[PDB]
């Protein structure tokens, strides 16, 4: 949806509500996103450096 | 807020975008304020009776 | 229990009886241990610009 | 002294403070990462 970014993405376990699509850290950044094509839960983690 | 944009609504609005500078200063001035009482506490009250 | 305001007490008042031929010599003693705390270091931190 | 240290929490305030301020500055430093500073976005990938 225009949210360009870079990181390793894997299956999540954090419970999104049926209507939410973003999870934010205390530092105000998106660490979890919902796939729009199919409804699944994912992490967005920066690849190690 | 009072120093930078005293008694003006519009000026108090643009200062909001700069984040937490205003909070940072007020703690810094408070940090030395409490410390001053600690000094005169330390040098004069060596006797309690 | 409630909250009250008052003037602080400079301590427990105690007068001493001076004289030109009076002395006091202790006859007993106690060995008490008192703690003391001092910081010695902080958590090191590095930041990439 | 074992009871004095265990029962009261204010005894170790001096050591606790230096831990706190170090955590405070880092929190504020990363908090400024979300402020626009006068631009139209705080996300450097959005403008690009
Ligand atoms: C000096 O003081 C100590 C205590 O500070 C005295 O020791 C106590 O003596 C009483 C006798 O009435 C005992 O009941 C206590 O059990 C003792 N305390 C301890 C910790 O053993 C001591 O007798 C005093 N000595 C002099 C010469 O005054
Ligand atoms: C995209 O197409 C798939 C079929 O492969 C469908 O299951 C999915 O619901 C479509 N996307 C949306 C947002 O409906």
Number of the ligand closest to the Cα of C28: 1
**Which candidate, A1, A6, A3, A4, places its Cα nearest to that of A45?**
A6
Shortest Cα–Cα distance, B18 to chain C (Å): 20
Measure in Å the smallest separation between the Cα of D18 and chain C Cα atoms: 7
Q: How far apart are CA A1 and CA C37, in angstroms?
A: 56
Which residues on B lie below 8 Å from D28 (Cβ)?
Answer: 20, 23-24
Q: What is the 3-state secondary structure (H, E, C) of C1-49?
A: CCCCCCCCCCCCCCCCCCCCCCCCCCCCCCCCCCCCCCCCCCCCCCCCC
What would the two tokens of residue C16 be? 């001493």
Q: Which of residues 14-43 of B touch D (CB under 8 A)?
A: 14, 17-20, 23-24
DSSP-assigned letters across all residues of A1-49: -------EEEE--S---TT--EEE-TTS-EEEEE-SSS--EEEEEPPP-
3-state secondary structure at position D46: helix
Residue D35 DSSP symbol: -
Closest by CA to A42, choosing from A20, A14, A19, is A14
d(CA A3, CA A26): 19
d(Cα A7, Cα A39) in Å, to the nearest integer?
A: 20
| Resolution value, angstrom units | 3.9
Residues in chain D with CB shorter than 8 Å from the CB of A28 are 31, 33-34
Does ligand 2 come within 6 angstroms of the Cβ of A1? no
Q: How was this structure determined?
A: cryo-EM
Give alpha helix (H) positions in D1-48: 2-7, 13-31, 44-47
């Amino acid at each position: 949806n225009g949210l360009t970014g870079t990181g390793v993405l894997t299956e999540s376990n954090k419970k999104f509500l049926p209507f939410q699509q973003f999870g934010r850290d205390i530092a105000d950044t998106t660490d979890a996103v919902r796939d729009p094509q199919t409804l699944e839960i994912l992490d967005i983690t920066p690849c190690s450096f | 807020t009072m120093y930078i944009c005293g008694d003006s609504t519009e000026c108090s609005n643009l200062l909001l975008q700069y984040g937490s500078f205003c909070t940072q200063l007020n703690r810094a001035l408070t940090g030395i304020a409490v410390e001053q009482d600690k000094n005169t506490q330390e040098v004069f009250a060596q006797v309690k009776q | 229990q409630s909250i009250i305001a008052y003037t602080m007490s400079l301590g427990a008042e105690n007068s001493v009886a001076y004289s030109n031929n009076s002395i006091a010599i202790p006859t007993n003693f106690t060995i008490s241990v008192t703690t003391e705390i001092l910081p010695v270091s902080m958590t090191k931190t590095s930041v990439d610009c | 002294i074992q009871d004095s240290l265990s029962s009261t929490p204010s005894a170790l305030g001096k050591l606790q403070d230096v831990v706190n301020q170090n955590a405070q500055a880092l929190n504020t430093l990363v908090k400024q990462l979300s402020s626009n500073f006068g631009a139209i976005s705080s996300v450097l990938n959005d403008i690009l």
